[PDB]
Structures are given as C-alpha cells and as structure tokens.
Design an enzyme around this catalytic site. Sequence first.
Site, PDB file in Angstrom:
ATOM      1  N   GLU A 179      61.155  34.909-137.773  1.00 57.08           N
ATOM      2  CA  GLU A 179      60.419  33.731-137.108  1.00 57.08           C
ATOM      3  C   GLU A 179      61.118  32.490-137.634  1.00 57.08           C
ATOM      4  O   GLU A 179      61.232  31.729-136.720  1.00 57.08           O
ATOM      5  CB  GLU A 179      58.949  33.805-137.425  1.00 57.08           C
ATOM      6  CG  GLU A 179      57.977  34.527-136.515  1.00 57.08           C
ATOM      7  CD  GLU A 179      57.898  36.175-136.879  1.00 57.08           C
ATOM      8  OE1 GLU A 179      58.697  36.766-137.794  1.00 57.08           O
ATOM      9  OE2 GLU A 179      57.189  36.943-136.330  1.00 57.08           O
ATOM     10  N   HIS A 212      44.957  37.661-137.925  1.00 56.11           N
ATOM     11  CA  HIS A 212      45.411  37.625-136.570  1.00 56.11           C
ATOM     12  C   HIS A 212      44.569  36.998-135.751  1.00 56.11           C
ATOM     13  O   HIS A 212      44.795  37.088-134.718  1.00 56.11           O
ATOM     14  CB  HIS A 212      45.633  39.106-136.263  1.00 56.11           C
ATOM     15  CG  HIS A 212      46.769  39.935-136.840  1.00 56.11           C
ATOM     16  ND1 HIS A 212      46.718  39.972-138.180  1.00 56.11           N
ATOM     17  CD2 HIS A 212      47.835  40.327-136.372  1.00 56.11           C
ATOM     18  CE1 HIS A 212      47.843  40.576-138.539  1.00 56.11           C
ATOM     19  NE2 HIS A 212      48.478  40.772-137.434  1.00 56.11           N
TER      20      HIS A 212
END
Lengths: 329, 329, 359, 362
Positions: free
Chosen positions: A59, A128
């Site tokens: 990322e 999440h």
Amino acid sequence: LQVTVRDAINQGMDEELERDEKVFLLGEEVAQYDGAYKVSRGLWKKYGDKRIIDTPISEMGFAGIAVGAAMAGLRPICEFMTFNFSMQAIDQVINSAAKTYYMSGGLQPVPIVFRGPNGASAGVAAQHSQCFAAWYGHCPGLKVVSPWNSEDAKGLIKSAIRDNNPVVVLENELMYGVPFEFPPEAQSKDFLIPIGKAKIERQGTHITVVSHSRPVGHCLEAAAVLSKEGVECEVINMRTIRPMDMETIEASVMKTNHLVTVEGGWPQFGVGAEICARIMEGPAFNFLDAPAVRVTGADVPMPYAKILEDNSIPQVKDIIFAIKKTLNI
Amino acid sequence: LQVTVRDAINQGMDEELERDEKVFLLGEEVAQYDGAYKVSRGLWKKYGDKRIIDTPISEMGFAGIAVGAAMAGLRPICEFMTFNFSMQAIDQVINSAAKTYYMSGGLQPVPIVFRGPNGASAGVAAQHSQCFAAWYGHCPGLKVVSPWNSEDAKGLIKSAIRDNNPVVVLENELMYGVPFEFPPEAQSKDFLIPIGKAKIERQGTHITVVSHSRPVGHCLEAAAVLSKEGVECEVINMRTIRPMDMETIEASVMKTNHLVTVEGGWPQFGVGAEICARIMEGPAFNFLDAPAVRVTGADVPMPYAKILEDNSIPQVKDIIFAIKKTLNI
Amino acid sequence: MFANDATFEIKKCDLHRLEEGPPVTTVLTREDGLKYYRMMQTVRRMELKADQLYKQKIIRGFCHLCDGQEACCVGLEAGINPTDHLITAYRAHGFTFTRGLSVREILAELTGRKGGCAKGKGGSMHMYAKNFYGGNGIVGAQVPLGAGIALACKYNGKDEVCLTLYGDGAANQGQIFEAYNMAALWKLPCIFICENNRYGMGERAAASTDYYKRGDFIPGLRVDGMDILCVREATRFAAAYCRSGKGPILMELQTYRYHGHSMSDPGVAYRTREEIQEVRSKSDPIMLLKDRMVNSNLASVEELKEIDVEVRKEIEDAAQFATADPEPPLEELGYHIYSSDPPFEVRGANQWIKFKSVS
Amino acid sequence: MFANDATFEIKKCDLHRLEEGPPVTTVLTREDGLKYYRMMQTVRRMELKADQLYKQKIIRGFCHLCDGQEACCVGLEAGINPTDHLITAYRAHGFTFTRGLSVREILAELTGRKGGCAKGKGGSMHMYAKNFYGGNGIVGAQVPLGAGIALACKYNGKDEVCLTLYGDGAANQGQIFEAYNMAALWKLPCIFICENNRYGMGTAVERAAASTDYYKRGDFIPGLRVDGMDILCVREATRFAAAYCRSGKGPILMELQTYRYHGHSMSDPGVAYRTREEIQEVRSKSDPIMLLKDRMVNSNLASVEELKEIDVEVRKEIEDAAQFATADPEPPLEELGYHIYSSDPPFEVRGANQWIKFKSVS
Ligand SMILES: Cc1ncc(C[n+]2csc(CCOP(=O)(O)OP(=O)(O)O)c2C)c(N)n1
Ligand SMILES: Cc1ncc(C[n+]2csc(CCOP(=O)(O)OP(=O)(O)O)c2C)c(N)n1
Ligand SMILES: [K+]
Ligand SMILES: [K+]
Ligand SMILES: [Mn+2]
Ligand SMILES: [Mn+2]
C-alpha cells in the site's frame, strides 16, 4: 433501467478510461481477479495490462507510485481494497499528495483519485470496519466524497477523475449490490456530479436530517415511517465531505428549526460534530428550536457477534428515536 | 524553582525508568544524540543500551516492534521525532494497539506510550506542522493527552507510563524551552496527573475559554488583557483529548453562559468541533446566551513564509476578537 | 594555448549482479570542464551564503546544505538529459540549481520572499522545477514517488528515465523495498540512488552498509561520489541501462557533506570535526576537478580564479535580492490549494477571517 | 506388535548464508506419530466443519481456512516449547488449536457466541492464547509485532524465541524489511517464517514478487527453504531454527512451501486463478496427513486400522463441538462495552445516539 452501485462505479471508470488514455487503474486484484468486490469487473479484459494494474500488497509503495505517476501528468485511480488499509499509505495521501500544489506555489498539481469501500461491513470486526470520512475531511488540499446511491457513485467517480487534485472517494461495501433506477441522464457518458454540493433526497418541514453514505437509506426509511404519524423529514445527502455544502444545510434548518445528523462513523471528532459546530457558528443557529443532535456508530472498536454489531451501527430505530427527542414527541 | 517543559518530561521518564525495569525508550536519536530536541538527554548514559534504544529511520517498523514488546509485557515509550512521522506508523497505533484489548475479549493489554512533538513549530512548513489531536482523539481504545506547561508534561507522561493501555502524548516543540515555576509537589517522584481531568488555569465569570497545548498560554495572555477592561475569562486547560473532561467544561459554561474554544489544529472535524457538539447536546446548552465559537489554525497546509505562518496559527488578538464577538462588546 | 580535452582515471565501481560496469577511464573536454567547474562553485557559494543567512536567522526552520556533495548533483546532471526526471529528499538546493532554477529564486525561497521559486510558500525543503519533483520532507516518501515518475516514463513511451534519490539514513525505509519490488516486476526505468555520506543525522542503524546491494534482485553499482567524472560515467551507464528496457538499477554514491554534524558528545564531535577537515583537504569535489584541469592543461589557475569571481558576484547579487525582496502579501495566504478551480474562501484563525483562494 | 520408532529421510533444505542446514534424517517415535496424526486430523475436520458452518450463515464476515497447511502448524508446534512465542496473520485456526485453545472455544468464537475464546468479540481473525498473539487482520502488521515479542524475549533473558509468520503476499510489505534490519541489528531471537502457499489472495507469486525465493529476501539474514507438506521436515527445520536463535546468533528466515485447498476466504471459490487439477495433484501427491499416514504404515509405527479409528474419533469430536458452538447463546448486549481498557475503573460508552449508554468494565 435498474443499476447497482457497483455497476454505476464501473461504468464511470470505463467511460473515463475510454475518454482519456492518461487515466489508468491500479491496486490489489483490480485486474485479472475482476476486482475484490467486482467493482472493476471486465476492465482488464477491455483495456489490458497497461491501464489496469494488479499490485503487490504494498500500500505505501503503490499509493506513492500512483502519486508520482500523477505528478508526471498521468491520472491514476488508486484503489484501496478497503480504506482500513489506506492507513499504511496515509502519509502518501496527505504529505505527498494533498499538500503539494500548495507547497509548490501552484506549480505542481496531483490529479490522483483514491477509492475503495469505507466503514462498516457485516461481521468483519474491528480492523476492517473503520470509517475514515472525518479523518480525510480534516485535511486541506484534499477533496473527499462519500456517495450513497448509483447516481451519486457514477457522477462522483467521474467528477473525481476529472478534477486535477487529490480526491478521496469513500465507497461502501453494503451498497455495492443495491440496485437503483438510473434515469437516462445518468446513463450518459457526460454525467457529472459536482463536488461540494449536497442533495435534498426528501423534502419535509419538521426536521432536517443530514447523512452520508449507506445511512442515507436508513434516514429515508425513518422518514417513511415518521410520515405516517404526520412528521415530515427533509433528508439531506451530503455527497461531499470536503468541502461540505453547509449552505444547503442552513437553508433547510431555517425552514425546519430542527437538526439531526446521521453517520456510520465513531462519534468524537466525527462528521456530525463538524456539522453541529458549523450550524452553531453560522446564520442558522437562531432558527434552531432544539439542540442539534448526532446519531453515530457506537464508540467502540467494531465487535464481531451479530447482536453486538447491530447495536454498534445506527439503525432506523435510533434515527427515529433522536428525531422524536428533538421534536419533543 | 523554574523547570522547562523539556526537563519536566525528562524527569518523568527518568523516574519511571527507575521505578520499573520493564519500562524502556526507543526511537530515532533518543540515546547517544541525547534526543532530537534533547528531551531524553542523559537517559542513555544513565540506563544503557538495553533500556534506551536508538532506532533506524523505520517508523512503522519500530512502532510495531514497540507494540509487540508491549503485548509481551514490557512497557515501551516509543518516540516519534515529530507526530507528522507517526502517519507512517499510524496503522500500528490504531489497529495493532488501540483495538486489541477489545478484540481479544480482554486477554491482551497493550501498555504502550507514543510521545513526541505535535503541531506547529517555526518555519518548518507544511509536512512538518500538522496537529494530530483530532485524529487520535477519534479512536476508541486509545487515550490521548496534550500537555501545556511543565507540570502538565511531567504528570501526564508519568500517568501515561503507568496506564496499561496505549496512550498518545502529543507534546509541543515550542514549549520545550519554556521555563515554569515548579511547586515542590511536582518535583516528587510520585507526582501524577490523572488522564481525563481538565484544569482551570484561571477562574472567571464572563466567558469560558477552553484550549490545549501551547495556545493555553495565549488564552491566559488574552485573559490578562481583557481583565484590564473588566472582562473575566475562565480559562480551561484540557490536558486530556480522549477521554476529554466535558463535565468540567459544562459546569464552567453554566456559570459563564459563553464558550470559545481555541486550538492550533485545522478547523474541520477538529477538537473545537467536538467540544461544541458536546456542549450543544448536553445540559449546558440552555445556559448559553450566545453561540459557542471556535478559534483554530487557518485551514491551509502550513505556509513557509513568516507573515503567512504568523497568520495561520491563532494569535492573542484572534482569541480576544472571538471573545468580544461572543460577549458582544 | 590549452589542451582541447584529456583522459582521466576514475575509480572502478563495485558491481552487484552485473558482469561489466562503467569504464575506468574517461574523456573531459575543456569546455565541459569549465562548465562543471562553474556549476560546482555556484553550488558551493550558494550554500555558504545560505549558511550565513541561516545563522543570521534570516532563513528559518530548516536549511540542509549539500556542500561537499557537489560532484553528485553536477555529475548526475552531466549524465542525463533535460527531459529526464529527478526527485530527491530535503537536501535539494544543488539539484534545484542543476535543474535550471536561478540562485535568486532559490535564496529568495529560502528567505521566505515573494520572489522565491515557490513564492515563499515552501522554504528550504520543498522546491520544484521542470522535471524536478522536490524537495520532499518525509524520509523515504520520495522513493515510491520516483518509481511512479518512472512508471510514467515507461507509459509515455518516450525513452526518458527517472533518478530517485534517498540518503543512507533513509535506506531502511520499508517503502523503498516496496518500490524496488514493483520497479523490478514492471521493469520501470528508475535509477535508485543512495547518496551515502556516512551519516543519517547524528551502522549504528544499518545491519548492512552495502547500499548498492540492498535491492537484492535489482543490480547495483557503487560509485565514488567525490569525483565529478566518476559520477558522470556511472550515471551515463545507469541511464543507458534503463533506456534499453532492462528495468531499474541502483547506484550508491559514496560522498560526504560538510554541514549538519552538531553532535553534543564532546569526544564524538571533536572526532567528526577532524574527519570533516581530512575529507575536505583530501577529497573536495571542486578542488579535485581544479587540480585535474590545471594539471592536464585544460584551463589556467587564474582562469578559474576569474570564474570564482564571477560566481561570488552572482551569489552576492542573489543574496541582496533575497534580503530586500518583499514577503508574499497576507492576502495570498489561501492561494493555490487546488489546481484548475474557481475562486473560493478559506477560514483563518476564527470565523470572521476569510482568505480568498485562487488556483 | 509395532516398532517404537523409525528413521526417516527428509528432504534436504535449500540454504541462504548457512554452511550447513538441518539433518536429512530424523527419528519418529510411535507416540509422537500418533499425536501429530491426531492433531493434523483435528485441524482438518475443524476447518471442514467451519466451511460448512459458514455456508449455513452461522459464521459471518471473514473465514480463512488452513486445510492443506496442517504440516506447518503442527510441525512448527513440535519444534518449539510451550514457552516459546508465535504470531501469525488471519489464517489462524490451526495455530490457535496447536497453541492451546480447544475446538469448542475456536468454533464458538467463529459462530459469535459467549463461549467463544473472546466471547464473540473478534471472530475468525482475532484469536489470542497464552504465547499466541493472533490472529492479525492487517497484512504484514504482525511481523514487527513478532520482532518486538522477540525483543521482549532477549530483554527478559529466558531463552525463549518467537516464531513470526507471514504469507507470500505479505512478503512484499515494507514493514517486513524494517523488521529484518532491526532484528539483525539487535540479534533478536526472531524466526521469520514465510508460509508460501503460492498465492496472495488471487495473485500468483510470479506476478507479485520479482524474486520468488522468499527464504533469501532477508538478504543479510540467513534463511532456509523447507518442504511444508512434510510434517517431519517442518519439525526438523523448526528445531534447527529455534536452536539457532536460542544460541544468540539473532534472527533467521524460514520459508515453508505449502498449499491451501480452499480459496483465499469463503467468498473466493479459488478456481479463477488456478486449475482444479492443480489442487487435485497437490492433494493427491502431497497431502500432509496422507504423507504421514504412509510413513507410519510402511515402517510399522501404526496400522491402517488404528488411524481410521482416530479419524472416526476426531470426526465425532468435531461434530460435538460444532453442536456446542451452534447452540451456545450470543453474548448478552450488556457486554457490548466491556474490555475497551485494561485495569480502569468502570465508565460509560455512547451508543448510536446520546440516550444510549453501555457500561464498560475492564
Ligand atoms: C519519516 C521521517 N522520519 C524522520 C524524519 C526526521 N529526519 C529528517 S532528516 C533525518 C536524517 C536522514 O538522513 P539521511 O537519509 O542519511 O539523509 P542526509 O541528511 O544525510 O542527506 C531524520 C531522521 C523525517 N524527516 N522523516
Ligand atoms: C494491509 C492489507 N492490505 C490488504 C489486505 C487485504 N488482503 C487480505 S488477505 C490478502 C492476501 C494475503 O495473502 P498471503 O500473505 O499470501 O496470505 P495467505 O492468505 O495466502 O495465507 C489481502 C491482499 C489486508 N487484509 N491488509
Ligand atoms: K482527477
Ligand atoms: K503505560
Ligand atoms: Mn546521510
Ligand atoms: Mn499466500
């Protein structure tokens, strides 16, 4: 014609790729896997390895490559599989992208888009489920949008790709498969929704309810229910988180005298806090016949067990209850 | 006598290192260099390689190593050279540390401290000027504190090291060199300031002024000036960002009927937004004779040039102006 | 009469995953020698002036100087084209000048004035120019950025390459390794460049100091960063490699910086001052080029003294422009937050303060 | 009458910066063989049951299954002490069992019930136990954590080591490289283990890694590549790696070559990016349990009859645990707020509007 939010976003990206060969898409599983939640389905088959790029799970690195590609004049769409994972890259979003045109004295634009689902899913638990709207909305040099339905999603994605500065598009996983009707003007490849403009989704006169992303649909079901008792909610879909369209919230509050904000994120320093502070500092404060109040996610890391999770996200009930406290009924 | 904010932090670390051999210090230049801003001066000579650990420039990595060491029962103090650089590591702070006690059902505590300077300094421009209070304050599982003077600084790092959960201690570079009178009880090794309690720095009757970090002192300068025209400010030093002491802010506003918040960070979704949201939601709302308003950093990445930077951070005159608007004088 | 050109020996590079490196011999024309010499001097004097204005407090916040490392920025520029791309960290004043900014616009950016290349908005660490992307304050963050610029070069199909610089202290940033992997996988024409000056502020920190090998699967070469011709050849070789389609490569530049050793242990700082003085007197970049040009009859001793004099003048003209120039006016605080947009308002320190923002 | 032990030849490991590797023969006692077999079969039936519970909607959200990789978790556990430390990512069910939790607690967690190991607060991805630190959902984040646990081992001086696990997709995380450098600098007793099951979600190793030699990625850190379908290989390579760390030489990399029969998670059918016949060849030539079965039969360590009986016992046992986990009540709502902070006095947490408050106690 019914079109799901996922297909709306996909049409938007497709049209913009077709329109401008500088646009390309990169991220985990966007290409040969057809997208982690199938948003980018068909795109690789149509445009090839050059335009639709599967990345390693790096990322910070690929968010930075994307920003660099934009500085050199390309126009990437950088996907985060969810926004929870943009935390590893958030340095690149804020210090390499948001601040640069300013630090450079207007010599260096960063026409990048960051997109991906944001906030709560179903049973994915604390790492999440995080909502990032207030975090990103906080930053000068960014624009930040949070679409609800299919029109919103296609029009904002296209506006985002067209804009010449960093734009964070906070999607929502539970909305991806919801179909909406899609008027012929959204079907157009010219359909744009301007950033910085809220939409009124339902007129009313008793109270102003503002939301963004999936809870907007919950505000609409709450209004349908309150309506049978004679209470008319003016429901406002923010669309843009930064720069938000406060003017439309003010005009609504001078009409209704009452304000409730509704958001999925954590409460403290969240989006509703900012709307309330603004309402209180702006011209509509005096028109308020009761305190502005906030409906939010519960102030816990998201629990896994079903009954805990249900009570961790705002539900129609909770919106109605705050609305009734506010109208004192 | 007089002790600088820096030397006060240094006394607290020293004492805590002495008290518990499980406590240790790591980050860039904390040992042989004596501290980037000399806060750890003399620690390494006194405690050695085992306890004061210089790290490579690898923020996400040493941050996670500290969190790991914490999960295994050690009590690390993890220093970011500035909080701007904590963005690289912010995933470890939020997802590895903040949420873990909750996710594990209470099996895995994470007694870690993150400290270092936060917010605006002088001339360091936009990637080095960011204020992070509202970002961290947003996250359940975290405690977040923000000391202004020497007594704040020493009491709060000591309480933080004593707490068994992640605490972010947002320090301030310009305050490091500022000497304060230091009462003999702050000199004690047992000196603690409880996280969660604000402090009234000045009693007053006409308006409540709430701030944190460096601007507290500007609130006091403003207050002294206004005192000469018969306006008495009650100045509140927050000390804790999460969980903020809102009861103390409430009782003040029920006495004074007016509220102005002052912070150095960006305005949208910032600390003042939360304080005003809370004030309007809570029991003090009806005691407000004027809307609560916010004094803040200007809403731009931090510009380099002096005259621009001077006008991007609140000055005494912007505090006094907002007060006078609030009292209508 | 002068020699038109001459041959010189340059340190052989250590190689990683290469069978041949750049030549060990090279040719300097006098014309090039003169140009490189002026350039290194201009950077040396500019940085000495900045150090002066910093210590006078006219320059604020940061002011990382690169004197000692001139062979790097001038050598790299000598090995590439104006249409190639370059990004580095915060010690960028030399690069800003070798990419074509005037000493004026650089010193006026340093002193925070309207005439700065960034209008006084960026200061020391954030200067941009044509095909020069900064000037970047977050250690490590520029390496992915450069990889992206390299991706843009590959995507545009115009045979340009990107030089992406980081220091030895930055070498353990995770995102550098993420970049190495994507660069190699996608065959990006990125030249990864470690400027190794032995210090990352003040092998206390690196398990391996063999920087040229850290890309592992990416090939690398170690170069003498004090010799301007040596940097020139390595760069020529490294850019050839990328243009030809073989993907990324690493170049470690072994160099040294005279400034920024404010150690507070008295033993260590004494020793560091000795070292500074040894390096300066045995391997000063400009001195090295001078000895060579005089000794091979490429230029005269007094011809270079003349250049010093023109350069002292350029820098003096620039310093006085930078100390007299007005600051940017307040009403421009909010300018350039976004590109290509219509005007809007930005809040100042309280709601009654409004700044207009134009693109 | 059964032999009490036997000697097996085990695949020789590939070495990075090591003069010699683990031995290529080892001794298996009958008692251990029986034990390893039962543990692997338990994990296998546990995961097959979790599949089935998931398809029934009794388990929600994420659910990553480790069948095919049983030689790893059981092999790793057999080369370390209970006092050693282990951390991994989210494909964690086998580890949580090999590391001490019962199947009831594991299944009850997955079905979100109060008897779960975290009382339903974490679900598939976040289980902890004694010296088992999850169970981490953010790819790569666990490696610096493992490097820090190892730091704690060196700090306390008890000679414990720490196994730090990451997948092949996670091998390209920058933070993995930050940890390498620090662990080598401080000689941390950290065993970095790359579980290489050839994919990182739907992305083949060749397509995401320029170099697919995971055991060499640590560069200056030494490494070994190990056959991760053979439990005796994992046992030995572990035993070797632990001893290496325990002797003070610092960290070491260990790559287990293994395979997952399931998709990446339950929503992924696991057939768009690899062939059904690729899965079938692996199950057929390299199943960890059948490779074990054959070794003990051909060397008379145990009979085919005996191991069928184990199979039947284990399958009934998973059936019992599953019924427990499906019938077990959800945690009560009152507890929504519990365990935000350790060791604090009780306090109040705000729910979805200001009128909603949940008690939070430590
Ligand atoms: C992510 C990050 N961490 C820390 C810093 C603070 N910092 C600035 S320079 C520096 C030393 C970096 O040195 P090196 O890469 O060797 O470059 P040099 O100054 O020697 O040219 C540090 C630790 C920073 N700017 N960014
Ligand atoms: C930082 C981060 N990025 C992306 C994801 C989404 N994601 C979850 S698992 C996964 C694949 C990881 O594969 P691998 O490391 O090989 O482990 P495996 O499941 O094969 O054991 C991805 C991309 C995530 N959870 N965290
Ligand atoms: K765009
Ligand atoms: K602590
Ligand atoms: Mn250096
Ligand atoms: Mn894998």
